[PDB]
Each structure stands twice: as structure tokens, then as C-alpha cells.
Amino acid sequence: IIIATKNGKVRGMQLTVFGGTVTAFLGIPYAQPPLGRLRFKKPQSLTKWSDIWNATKYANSCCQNIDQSFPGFHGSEMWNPNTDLSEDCLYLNVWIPAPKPKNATVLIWIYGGGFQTGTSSLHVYDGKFLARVERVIVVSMNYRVGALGFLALPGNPEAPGNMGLFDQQLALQWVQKNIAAFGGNPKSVTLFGESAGAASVSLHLLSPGSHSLFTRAILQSGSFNAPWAVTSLYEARNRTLNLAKLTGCSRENETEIIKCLRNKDPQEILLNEAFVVPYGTPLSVNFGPTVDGDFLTDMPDILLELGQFKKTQILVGVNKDEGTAFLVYGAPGFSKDNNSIITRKEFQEGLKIFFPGVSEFGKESILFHYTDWVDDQRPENYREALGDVVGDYNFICPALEFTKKFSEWGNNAFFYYFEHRSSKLPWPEWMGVMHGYEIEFVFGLPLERRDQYTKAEEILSRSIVKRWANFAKYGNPQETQNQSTSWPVFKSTEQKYLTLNTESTRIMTKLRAQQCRFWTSFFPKV
């Protein structure tokens, strides 16, 4: 099956999914390759081609550093890129149902990875199940990460910043111009992403250039007001200058530096990205979004607080154990290969790792709020406390605060709390319901009866997929049929949220209330 797009014909391939068929278009280009003089610049528009572009395999992933902490371990390596790294990486994928739909709701995925890593070709991002089961069209794109996607000299178009966000945006534009030819409805587009993907989604709700490119938004374990999500104009300059010094590209003509950095191999630039931060943490975002004055006209907390954003429905949520994944990438006494019972002194040293530039008093205050023990004798007390600290500060409390702020301007919001630990999850049991391990269920992998998921997980994925699709299609994430628990809207007074798990789906109120008052009211003062 061949589809004419605005720049030429693309050839797809046919997949067999659950005694049915999905048509996949893998690796459609959506921009000029950002090579040569185009490196660091905004994405540029594609010239027409006259042949039939063969979009039958995933394209190159964007250049990025690889996580090497656990060679050969599936828990880490399932996130590493699975196509060639290349600067020539601006491509996207389309999964359309067979038979070709008439006017199908579109779902556009934006992956995470700290704005430094990630790729759409990952196994847990396979959109074929969603196309098959719910008859939506699924789209995902590669966008530039790390310095190549977010190096910033504010105002200088040679490296203005937010390039990777503009990559995402050009891809949203491609869906507006072309998805009708695939049987998709450009007027029913829902963005969803996880982690830095989710924070990207939240920034598309703030960027005026994106408002007409989508209908609704879903934010999984991430939002722009998370402390790791935005780099300051200060740090972006200090980081850019450090990179120039590390590469021997220190000049004075601000442009003669970009020229110099444009003659370096991608590998030299990736080498030096690690040391532009003076003190890194497991959550360091060396090169991320900035207030460029183009994609983002003001500091996003101000836009949020004053209601300057797209008015539409949002779906937001977090996992029970967001913080534990990061503990084994640096904290003392932690190991994925033992139960990581840490002492008080280990805990204290762990705060220095995750809060390097924070005062003695700031760290004491974290210790104080999180070491009032419901039982003071439990040996896991400090191990659990450190994960909760990292998770509440870095994910859970910023997401709650985004949802409160956003819903105060009249729009329906739905909040979930994911607390099912995958039965195939390769990390140890003390790490719990980890960051990123709801994605399997959102994409419907447990629906594959061949895998090792239980029947309970098939049913739970089955409802999540239904709820997500009903949110994309109708702005209302109900499962109206198998007598499901009704998901209430998140109001700033009541703060009702839905818990997702295999046993019992319940309505609760005011998640992590005590913890988030500390992080969102007090801690910003220090």
C-alpha cells in the first residue's frame, strides 16, 4: 500500500496483529537532515522527492550517549537506542489500522530520556497494538537530544536553543498537512509522552506556535515545572562556554564558536557534554529546554501561574516509585543486586548526591520531613525515604502542582496513580513501581498473550488502553462498559485521582499532601 504525501509517495509494510492487520510506515523523513551548516539550527523544510520513499524499517536514532552502568542487563538496555546513531535522524513513524480508517483520532508519542537520550524505535513504543485494538492512528518522531538538540546562545539563530522541541513541532506540523491522506483526523490529535517526553508535551501547551497542532494532552511522569525540566539562561550560557572550552572552540565572535563546534565530529561533542555541568546528578539535564524567546516567550512557571496556555483537557499521572530507578545510578549503599538497606549516614550522603548545590540547612530539612518514622525500627526506613525524596521532588509533586494550576483555568483534568509492578520487570523488588514501567501497559504489550504477562496484566492494560483512547477521542477517559470505576475530574479543592492496579481501582484524594507541601511551598525558599 502506497500513500501520496505532500512531498511524495511513501511505501508501507503490513503487520499481522491479533488475527488482523496494521499498516506501518516506519522512518518517514520530516525535515532536511540537520547536518553541516545546519547543525544546531532549527529544523528546515523538506524538498519534494519524486520516487517512492521506502518507509519499511525504523530510521537512524539521533546521536546520544549510551547508559553503560549495567552492560547486558535488560532493565537498562531496553532504553538504549536500537538503530544506528546518526545526526541524520529527523524521521517519524505512522501506524494506521487496516482496513484504512475514515477519520481516526491520532495519537502522537514524544519519548523521554532526560532530553539527552531516547528514540521512537524502542520496543515499548510499538504503536501497532494501539492501532489494532482501538483503531487510532499512532505517530512517533525522533528529535535531537543533548547539546545537538538544545545547545543555547539566546538570540543567536546559529544555536538558538530548543531545536529538539522545534523538531517535535515540525513533526506535529507534518501530521496536520499529511495525516488525512492516511485516514487520520488532523482535528483530533492527542499528544502523549513520558518523563522528558511528558515535559515536552506540557511545553507544547505553553508554546503559541503549537496551539493549532493538537487537541488534547496526556502527561506520564513528567511536566515542565519539574526541577530538571528547564535550563536557565544563566546555566545554558555557562554550559555552552564550557563546551567551547572543552573542544578548543573558545572564540569571541559568538558565531565563530558555532562554526568551530560545527567542524567537530559528533563523537567529540558527546564526550564533552558530561563535564559541562560542574556537579552532575543522576537526573542532570546538561542541555535541555530554555527560555529562547521563540518556542518559549517567558519563564514557564509564570505562564502556568497566569493562565497563558492552551485551553483543553489534560490527562496527568505518576507512578508509585518514581524515585528508585535513580538511587542505583549514584547513591551510596544502593545496588540492584541486593536489598540496599542503608544507614542514616548513607541516606545523608545520598542527599549530597541528589542535592549537590543545596545548603547544609536545606539538606537537614529534607532529612527532617522524611525521617519521622511511622516505625523507627524498620531497616528499610532510609532506603525507602531516599527513593520517596527523589520521586516526590522530581516527579510526583511537580505533576500535582501542574494539574492544580492548569485546572484552575476551567479545563477538565484527570489524574492517575499507577501502582502495578510489571510481572516481567527485571529490576529487583525493592525498587517497586519504577519510573517508566507504566509505558508497557499504555502501549498494550500485555495484550500479547505470547509474552509472560499474567491475565491480570492483560486486563489492566486492556482498560488503560481503552481509557487513553477514549480520552484522545472524546476527552473523557472512562471505560463505559465493563462496569469500571468512573474516573472523576481533578478539581483543585477535592483533588480526586484514580489508582490503576490489577486488584481494585479506587478514587482517592490529595495524593502525597504532606510531602508536596514541603517541596512546593517550603523547599523553594532555600
Ligand X SMILES: O[C@H](CNCC1CC1)[C@H](Cc1ccccc1)NC1c2ccccc2-c2ccccc21
Ligand Y SMILES: *[C@@H]1O[C@H](CO[C@@H]2O[C@@H](C)[C@@H](O)[C@@H](O)[C@@H]2O)[C@@H](O[C@@H]2O[C@H](CO)[C@@H](O)[C@H](O)[C@H]2NC(C)=O)[C@H](O)[C@H]1NC(C)=O
Ligand Z SMILES: CC(=O)N[C@H]1[C@H]([C@H](O)[C@H](O)CO)O[C@@](O)(C(=O)O)C[C@@H]1O
Ligand U SMILES: *[C@@H]1O[C@H](CO)[C@@H](O)[C@H](O)[C@H]1NC(C)=O
Ligand V SMILES: *[C@@H]1O[C@H](CO[C@@H]2O[C@@H](C)[C@@H](O)[C@@H](O)[C@@H]2O)[C@@H](O)[C@H](O)[C@H]1NC(C)=O
Residues 6+ apart with CB under 8 A from 474: none
Catalytic residue among 322, 384, 457, 479: 322
Binding partner at 187 among ligand Y, ligand V, ligand X, none, C-beta below 5 to 8 Å by kind:
ligand Y
Q: Could you say which of 479, 487, 516, 519 contacts ligand U (CB under 6 A)? A: 479
Residue 339 engages ligand Y in binding (rule: CB under 6 A): yes
Distance CA 120, CA 440 (A): 14
Binding partner at 113 among ligand X, ligand V, ligand Y, none, C-beta below 5 to 8 Å by kind:
ligand X
Distance CA 460, CA 46 (A): 42
Shortest approach of ligand V to residue 24 CB, angstroms?
A: 12
Beta strands at 216-220 and 314-319: parallel, antiparallel or unpaired:
parallel
Transcribe 390-410 into DSSP letters. Answer: HHIIIIIHHHHHHHHHHHTTT
Annotated catalytic residue 435: yes
Three-state DSSP state, 253: coil
Q: Which stretch binds ligand Z (CB under 6 A): 29-37, 224-232, 420-428, 436-444?
A: 420-428
Residues 261 to 280: which contact ligand X by CB under 6 A? none
Residue 253 engages ligand U in binding (rule: CB under 6 A): yes
For the window 216-245, what string marks contact with ligand X as x by the rule CB under 6 A? ------------x-----------------
Q: Measured between alpha carbons, how far apart are the two ends of the chain, in Å? A: 60
Annotated catalytic residue 322: yes
Per DSSP, which regions of 30-103 are E strands? 52-54, 91-98
Q: Which stretch binds ligand Y (CB under 6 A): 40-48, 109-117, 180-188, 322-330?
A: 180-188
Compute how many residues bind ligand X; rule: CB under 6 A: 18
Annotated catalytic residue 195: yes
Residue 428 engages ligand Z in binding (rule: CB under 6 A): yes
Residue 406 engages ligand Z in binding (rule: CB under 6 A): no
Which long-range contacts does 242-249 make (Cβ < 8 Å, 24+ apart)?
A: 242/275, 242/276, 243/147, 243/151, 243/269, 243/272, 243/273, 243/276, 246/272, 246/275, 246/276, 247/272
Residue 504 engages ligand U in binding (rule: CB under 6 A): no
Query: Which of 133, 24, 94 lies closest to 470 in space, CA to CA?
Result: 133
- Nearer residue to ligand Z within complex by CB, 252 or 429: 429
Shortest approach of ligand X to residue 514 CB, angstroms?
A: 24
Is 436 within any annotated ligand binding site?
Answer: no
Residue 379 engages ligand Y in binding (rule: CB under 6 A): no
Compute how many residues bind ligand U; rule: CB under 6 A: 9
Answer whether the bond into residue 99 is a cis peptide, omega within 30°. yes
Look at the alpha carbons of 448, 450, 452, 454 in this order and tell me if their dihedral is positive or negative.
Answer: positive
Shortest approach of ligand U to residue 467 CB, angstroms?
A: 9
Q: Could you say which of 51, 337, 372, 375 contacts ligand Z (CB under 6 A)? A: 337
Residues 35 to 94: which contact ligand V by CB under 6 A? 54, 56
User: What amino acid occupies position 17?
Assistant: V
Q: Which helix (H) or strand (E) holds 107?
A: strand 104-110
- Nearer residue to ligand Z within complex by CB, 372 or 429: 429
Distance CA 47, CA 57 (A): 21
Active-site residues, by number, are 195, 322, 435
Kindly list the residues in this chain that would bind ligand Y in the complex (CB under 6 A): 102-103, 185, 187-188, 238, 242, 245-246, 275, 278, 332-333, 335, 337-339, 341
- Binding-site residue positions for substrate: 113-114
Summarize the annotated binding site for tacrine as residue ranges.
Answer: 79, 435
